[PDB]
Amino acid sequence: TPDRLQQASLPLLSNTNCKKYWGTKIKDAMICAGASGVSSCMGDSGGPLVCKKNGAWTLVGIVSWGSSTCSTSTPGVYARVTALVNWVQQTLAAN
Amino acid sequence: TPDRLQQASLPLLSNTNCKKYWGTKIKDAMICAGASGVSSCMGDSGGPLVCKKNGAWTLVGIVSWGSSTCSTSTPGVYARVTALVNWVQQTLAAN
Amino acid sequence: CGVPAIQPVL
Amino acid sequence: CGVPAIQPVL
Amino acid sequence: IVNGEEAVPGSWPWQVSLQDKTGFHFCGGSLINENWVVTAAHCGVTTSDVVVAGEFDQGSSSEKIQKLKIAKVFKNSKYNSLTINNDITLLKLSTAASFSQTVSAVCLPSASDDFAAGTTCVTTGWGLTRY
Amino acid sequence: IVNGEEAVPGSWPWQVSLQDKTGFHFCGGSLINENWVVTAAHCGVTTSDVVVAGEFDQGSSSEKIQKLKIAKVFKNSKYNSLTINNDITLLKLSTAASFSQTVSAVCLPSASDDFAAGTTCVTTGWGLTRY
């Protein structure tokens, strides 16, 4: 693991486009990013994928899976927050 | 997942032999089995790999990882119990 | 341990 | 939320 | 398991099913005593999951299954999530399993037992039988 | 991250390090409030792991880090370990994080926000930078 914190800007892809690389392993509650020369790799899991919106960083994805090789030509797969926020909110609400 | 419980007899391999298939991903606390026409697959994880010894089934390995494809030509990887039993025993002992 | 009441058949 | 005190530079 | 076969029911008594609260099987485990279960650390079990013992057919509703609650999760501290090495977690039951003809314990090996390459063993489970 | 670069220290304030009792980083997380952390369900966090906030360099001993205890682990029940779908778990802190210049929360999107293919975002972490 590196000692200090790293970062990388990367592009979001469509699920349909992702699937050319990961087939049916791609689900609706997942979102793809990368294949642009950097990649999320072991140890990055659970970490964030954020986007800027109305000037505020927003959690769009959570680091999930990608190349067993961390290939920078294959996209990384991230849990899709938009599909998960409803559960997030109920959980906070009742606990 | 199938509804009923499945089983399969399979051979243990040497770590050195395993490594021809999984390289350096193979560690001392792992043990390989399979590549014999059956394979452990998703859902089998955490389950047992047992051997008969002095007529008693003994937990030799725990289903860990293997082919992303569940290929029956590649060996499955199992956590090696022999390397783990010491911690198992201390844990029971103090809890 | 390790001796089932119902024998496995393989 | 989402506005760090120390700005990221990318 | 792919290329497996159907086991005789109740013939692998230590075999447990780890299920989420939704009742979905996500991982297997082995009873080593009436109070503890061994499983893989990467299964990521929590106190909210359930240990099911004495099960053969998960579709059946006539089986006298044992749904056991999980008191505490002991993730081996040598476990390495990056490399999946030392993949072992211990689950202590909040309620003791009732041993029977169909629910009993697997034996554990000494740290030094030798298990030769070429030996034919057995693995079981409810994982995919088709990928 | 491979092909990444060094971040300005403390510039991603919601970034937390999930560490085992041995102190080994195995997964990242994001504070969404002073009491809760979001992470991936497959990380298999337990009550024994620790949430570390305000960290930049894990080798440093001069950083005013925040080692927070984990009260409870809320694994999304829609999570599918077989397929890694719905990979999300919530971690409620037993002690509230102290927000500061270097420890603050990420924003969450509405269920219906649209985030277009082609948009350039940012991901961070301490994972391998070399495979």
**β-sheet strand percentage of chain E:** 25-35%
Largest interface: A-F, 65 and 69 residues
Widest β-sheet, arrangement of strands of chain E: 2-3-4-7-6-5
**Which CATH first-tier class of chain E would you pick?**
Mainly Beta
Q: Could you say which structural class the secondary elements and strand pairing of chain E correspond to?
A: mainly beta
Percentage of residues in helical conformation of chain E: under 10%
Q: Characterize the largest beta sheet of chain C: strand count, sense, and whether it forms a barrel.
A: none
PDB class: hydrolase(serine proteinase)
Keywords: hydrolase(serine proteinase)
Assembly: hexameric
Entry title: three-dimensional structure of chymotrypsin inactivated with (2S) N-acetyl-L-alanyl-L-phenylalanyl-chloroethyl ketone: implications for the mechanism of inactivation of serine proteases by chloroketones
Task: Provide a short characterization of the protein structure.
The complex is a heterohexamer, with 2 copies of chain A (95 residues), 2 copies of chain C (10 residues) and 2 copies of chain E (131 residues). With 95 residues, chain A is of the alpha+beta class.
Word description of this protein:
The complex is a heterohexamer, with 2 copies of chain A (95 residues), 2 copies of chain C (10 residues) and 2 copies of chain E (131 residues). Chain A is of the alpha+beta class. Helices cover 19% and strands 35% of the residues of chain A. In chain A, strands 2-5-4-3 form a 4-stranded antiparallel β-sheet, with helices on one face. Chain C is elongated. Chain E has 131 residues and is mostly beta strands. Chain E has a single domain (1-131), classed as Thrombin, subunit H (Beta Barrel), CATH 2.40.10.10. Chain E has a 6-stranded antiparallel β-barrel with strand order 2-3-4-7-6-5. Chain E is globular, with a radius of gyration of 15 Å. Classes of the chains: A alpha+beta (95), C little secondary structure (10), E mainly beta (131). The interface between A and F is large, with 65 and 69 residues. Strand 1 of chain B pairs antiparallel with strand 8 (120-125) of chain E.
